[PDB]
């Protein structure tokens, strides 16, 4: 077993040219699709806000059309899922994870049209779901499609073009290339056995889809907080404390997000029409809330810059938090098409800020800016619910461009993952995979 | 299927004992990495202190610069040859093998040898980085506490070995993420699954970073300031530089490997023909650290200057080929010290050179040569050592130029791609392949 390694070391990093060229065409498509989906969703938010202006008089008539437009667009969404691809509900990041374990089918011919046009509806109605879910899943399925259409044989070509797909998926969802790459080699990989995921191949895909997003969304960042104040060493422990608070809350959110799935499964009971009707019900509520106090509704990317600057009051933040927890739950746990990834950043920012403020008045000698703590806490909910800290830390860093806050980010992030462990919490994306896989072994 | 459901619910469950020990590993590694870093500078200060007293007579100073650097190199090579032969060169090859369980982690020997030996070689002003020493000392420190505390198991062994070397790189460059990303790209047994707890690696990397920030706060290793952005129609220039780095990546490997062979003839394994050639190289570096210091030393001192476009086209080419020469001499001679850092410097000088060519070639892209310098900085790591993701995230952590992320990644990938299709190999796995195949031959 010594002589094998010498043969292996000299034959390391040898991905066949065919895989790499295909990785490139995977990314290119994923990006364009992630751009198409990103554009479509925006247009609908614009159309909906275009109708509110036609009915701007009569107050109850406006509140009705905000509901009915968001209801019908959610109704459209849930149906396209329930009738043509049941796997494309919820995030679908659990699904692509199982696909890499070879325990799930990657029915692209079904998911692509369902997740795209379905998500378009649910996101475009302004529900509390991210783009990730749709684009990550769509991503993997795109990469799978070209494995099938080009009939590429082997273990290496299947896992890799499935991985890069999902990678270039997240990369174009956040304009965050590294985050995509780092997501795959922390979360997505079969965590218990060795896999033939060519990391060099993942790159080329991620490179392409980023470029593809940069062609259409140039010069306009998703999040602009600008350069913040540094964090001196004697402050660090406060980030550890925030980590720990995020740590205990991390699993507590998981239990709710999982339990809420069960509690909503009774309302419809597996029935297609009791679901779709409940889907419009939650959808309309978001389109309603996207008018009465839009910080409770929507993707969430819109309050992050505002919360970080410390423009909300202590009262307002608490309201925004608890209300978003409510609306995050309802929309994701109801198995609507759309990720819980983004709304987790939003929730973490609002908590970070809140902690920052408490710290600002309690420790005037640290010369604290609450916005620092918001950034530390931004990717913390990812590190404690999803338990992909390194992904979360490099995701935040790619959108906030605040490297000077690297230590407090890592320390909060780690504090989240350690206390998320010793409270019996579980990786949310693996927990759904374990639930979906053990709900297949239990009706036989 | 039923196994996976039991696996997923039991994922990321590192026992508290490992995590506590991960924390104590880092804390030590950092402190030592700080201690080593201080010592090396102290001696560069002592050497520069003697040049002051013999500042008159011109050939007298050139001689004491030689003899100070010779003696300090001679002390280094000997400390390696007589008490730990495994502690020569980088030692990153070594720790890699230790993770595959095919090498012994003789800390009782390496720690004092690498530390006090490196102190000599580095502090004499040789073209070696801090990484080698700090990465190695790193893993060895982490191994020490596995032995002293008698921690049983596969997980405890690979983890406290990994974080050790991770917290090692972390304190070497004040680059936490670079440490963590090095371990899950290069260091990990690339061909089978390992029990390296990623969460444990963090805790160690955290501690050693803090340990370094306590002693070196408010002073960065590289300061380039915020550069201009890179417009989309420019990206292909970074692919072209990637390609150029791609073909040169292996060509440097061949020489660094081949120069080890050609220098092995000068001494032939003999201790005294080695040490006396060790002072010969060391002295030359301390002499060069006066006649044109940009060809000598760690190299971190020219990067800022090169990136600002302060050098002329001639100057750069000289500083490049001269560093090629001196980089080879110092690492290939198996002196203690890494080739990691000198490869950054080499890449900056090449990047800059490419930038300037591009500046007057395409005045309409409104180019800053310093952007290309940053793209090319970690490219030689991506092509010779073939750890692109670590290289990219290392540079980003020291230059803080995120807006240059796409050109960096493109150059970086362009290097790794063309470093493959010209038959080149991961230089740190190539030395492992050589040291392991000269044990069965």
């Amino acid at each position, epitope marked *: 077993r010594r002589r094998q390694l010498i043969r292996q070391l000299l034959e390391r990093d040898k991905t066949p040219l065919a895989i790499l060229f295909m990785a490139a065409v995977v990314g290119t498509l994923v990006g364009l699709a992630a751009v198409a989906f990103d554009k479509g969703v925006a247009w609908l938010q614009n159309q909906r806000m275009g109708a509110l202006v036609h009915t701007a008089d009569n107050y109850p008539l406006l509140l009705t059309v905000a509901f009915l437009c968001s209801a019908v667009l959610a109704m459209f969404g849930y149906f396209l899922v329930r009738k043509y691809a049941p796997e494309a509900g919820g995030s679908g990041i659990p699904e692509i994870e199982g696909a890499l374990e070879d325990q799930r089918p990657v029915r692209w011919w079904r998911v692509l049209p369902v997740k795209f046009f379905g998500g378009l509806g649910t996101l475009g109605g302004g529900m509390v779901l991210g783009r990730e879910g749709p684009t990550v899943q769509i991503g993997g399925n795109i990469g799978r499609m070209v494995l099938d259409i080009f009939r590429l044989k082997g273990d290496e070509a299947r896992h890799t073009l499935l991985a890069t797909g999902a990678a270039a998926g997240l990369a174009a969802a956040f304009n965050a290339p590294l985050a995509g790459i780092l997501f795959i080699i922390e979360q997505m990989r079969p965590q218990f056995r060795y896999t033939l995921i060519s990391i060099k191949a993942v790159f080329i895909g991620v490179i392409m889809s980023t470029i593809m997003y940069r*062609i259409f969304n140039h010069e306009v960042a998703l999040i602009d907080v600008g350069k913040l104040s540094d964090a001196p060493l004697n402050t660090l422990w406060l980030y550890l404390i925030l980590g720990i608070i995020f740590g205990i809350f991390g699993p507590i959110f998981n239990k709710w997000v999982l339990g809420m799935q069960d509690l909503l499964h009774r309302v419809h009971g597996g029935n297609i029409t009791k679901w779709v009707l409940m889907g419009g019900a939650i959808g309309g509520l978001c389109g309603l809330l996207g008018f009465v106090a839009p910080a409770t509704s929507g993707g969430g990317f819109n309050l992050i810059p505002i919360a970080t600057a410390g423009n909300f009051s202590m009262g307002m933040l608490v309201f925004i938090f608890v209300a978003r927890v409510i609306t995050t739950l309802l929309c994701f746990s109801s198995g609507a098409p759309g990720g819980i990834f983004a709304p987790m950043l939003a929730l973490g920012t609002v908590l970070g800020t809140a902690f920052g403020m408490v710290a600002v008045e309690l420790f005037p000698q640290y010369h604290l800016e609450a916005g620092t703590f918001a950034i530390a806490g931004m990717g913390a909910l990812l590190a404690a619910s999803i338990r992909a800290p390194l992904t979360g830390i490099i995701l935040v860093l790619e959108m906030t461009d605040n490297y000077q806050l690297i230590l407090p980010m890592i320390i909060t992030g780690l504090g989240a993952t350690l206390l998320a462990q010793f409270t019996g919490g579980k990786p949310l994306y693996s927990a759904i995979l374990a639930r979906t896989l053990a709900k297949q072994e239990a009706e036989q | 299927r039923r196994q996976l459901i039991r696996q997923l619910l039991e994922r990321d469950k590192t026992p508290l004992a490992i995590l506590f020990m991960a924390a104590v590993v880092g804390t030590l590694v950092g402190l030592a990495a700080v201690a080593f870093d201080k010592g090396v500078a102290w001696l560069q200060n002592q050497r520069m202190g003697a040049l002051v007293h013999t500042a008159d007579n011109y050939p007298l100073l050139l001689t004491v610069a030689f003899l100070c650097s010779a003696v300090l190199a001679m002390f280094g090579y000997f400390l390696v040859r007589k008490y730990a032969p495994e502690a020569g060169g980088s030692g990153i090859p070594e720790i890699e093998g230790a993770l595959e369980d095919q090498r012994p982690v003789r800390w009782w020997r390496v720690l004092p040898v690498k530390f006090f030996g490196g102190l000599g070689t580095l502090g004499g002003g040789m073209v070696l980085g801090r990484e080698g020493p700090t990465v190695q000392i790193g893993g060895n420190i982490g191994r020490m506490v596995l032995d002293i505390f008698r921690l049983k198991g596969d997980e405890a062994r690979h983890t406290l070995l990994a974080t050790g070397a991770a917290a090692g790189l972390a304190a070497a460059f004040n680059a936490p993420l670079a440490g963590i990303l090095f371990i899950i790209e290069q260091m990990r047994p690339q061909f089978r699954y390992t029990l390296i707890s990623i969460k444990a690696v963090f805790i160690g990397v955290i501690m050693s970073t803090i340990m370094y920030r306590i002693f070196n706060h408010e002073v960065a290793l590289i300061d380039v300031g915020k550069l*201009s952005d890179a*417009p*989309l*129609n420019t990206l292909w220039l970074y692919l072209i530089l990637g390609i150029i780095f791609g073909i040169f990546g292996p060509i440097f490997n061949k020489w660094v490997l081949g120069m080890q062979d050609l220098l092995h003839r000068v001494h032939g394994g003999n201790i005294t023909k080695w040490v006396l050639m060790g002072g010969a190289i060391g002295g030359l570096c301390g002499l060069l650290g006066f006649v044109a210091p940009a060809t000598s030393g760690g190299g971190f001192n020219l990067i800022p200057i090169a990136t600002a*476009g302060n050098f002329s086209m001639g100057m750069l080419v000289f500083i490049f080929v001269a560093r090629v020469i001196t980089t080879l001499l110092c690492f290939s001679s198996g002196a203690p010290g890494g080739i990691f850092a000198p490869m950054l410097a080499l890449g900056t000088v090449l990047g800059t050179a490419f930038g300037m060519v591009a*500046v007057e070639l395409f*005045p*309409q892209y*409104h180019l800053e040569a310093g952007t290309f310098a940053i793209a090319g900085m970690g490219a030689l790591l991506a092509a010779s050592i073939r750890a692109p993701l670590t290289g990219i995230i290392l540079v980003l952590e020291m230059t803080d130029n995120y807006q240059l992320i796409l050109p960096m990644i493109i150059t970086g990938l362009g290097a790794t791609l063309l470093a493959q299709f010209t038959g080149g190999k991961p230089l740190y796995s190539a030395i492992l392949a050589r040291t392991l195949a000269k044990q069965e031959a």
Partner: antibody
Amino acid sequence: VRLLESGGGLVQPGGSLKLSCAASGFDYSRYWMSWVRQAPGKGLKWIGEINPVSSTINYTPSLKDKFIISRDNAKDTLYLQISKVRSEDTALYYCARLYYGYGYWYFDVWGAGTTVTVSS
Amino acid sequence: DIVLTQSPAIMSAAPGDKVTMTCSASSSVSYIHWYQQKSGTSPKRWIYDTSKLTSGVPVRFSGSGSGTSYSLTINTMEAEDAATYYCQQWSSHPQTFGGGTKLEILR
């Protein structure tokens, strides 16, 4: 964001004048500044650009010091020193903040302009 | 340098008219920009990169073309459009401007 240039006016043929362009509302760094002139009732002609750090300065087919472009990052002010003034240099002089789209550069924000008449 | 010249020297049309002016290039160019200059104003970056609109330009305006012939098009013109419109490029150095299409209004 506002570019407010001045310093132009009356000068005798063959002489020299310095043109000032002050700026406020945007980081004066990051941006290459440019100079573009327009002769009465005619078209637009490029004079010269300058990078943020004053370290790459190109002009149009002029001659020696026909035009001299400088800046003062601390003052937020752009300068144009025109030498050996002949009747063609009688024009309006805009300072323009230079930016790009896909990567072919445009002129983003134009000033109001000062007038340079060359008469005795 | 690249010598551009603009289609009509002075064109006149009544609001409602679809109106197109053209930027013709001595050599080949790419991603040209359009500038607007209303009477006694300093020019305003109007259209850029061949067809992108600057933020705050009535969406009746459009851009198109490649190589030798680039254009600007006011689909259903309005009288508040009376201006001398300049075209300019920077695909090749030094950047050069057009002549202008002094648009006039018929009422």
